[PDB]
Amino acid sequence: SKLPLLTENGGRVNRVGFTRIAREGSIHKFGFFYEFTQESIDFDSDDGLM
Amino acid sequence: SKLPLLTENGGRVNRVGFTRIAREGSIHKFGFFYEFTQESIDFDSDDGLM
Structure with a gap:
């Protein structure tokens, strides 16, 4: 038909057309940390814990 | 007399005079035409139709 x-x-008689589409992406930020004290390093039995 | x-x-005594006349003509335009197609020539049984 x-x-x-x-x-x-x-x-x-016969006309045609075209189309284009777009994609996208984004970035984010992550992180974490830890804390310690001087006594924890100095008086611990195991050196090199760091 | x-x-x-x-x-x-x-x-x-006896004076005379003269006269002159002017004539003219103009031109006109004519034309005619005809049309055809490619399949009318390609598929017709008689070559040399044109």
Whole structure:
């Protein structure tokens, strides 16, 4: 039913068009930390805990 | 009655005059045409139709 067919004298019969689309992405930030004291390092039995 | 006679004395008698006429003509334009298609030539049984 939807085939493009011409005739003997054909003009302005079969017009077509085009389309484009877009994609996107984003970035985020992460992080974490820990704390300690001087006594914890100095008086601990295990050196090199750091 | 209207002959140009003179007398021995002469004088300002028997004066005449002249005239001219003008004629004219103009031009015009004509034309005609015809149309055809490609399949009318390609698929017709008789070559040399044009």
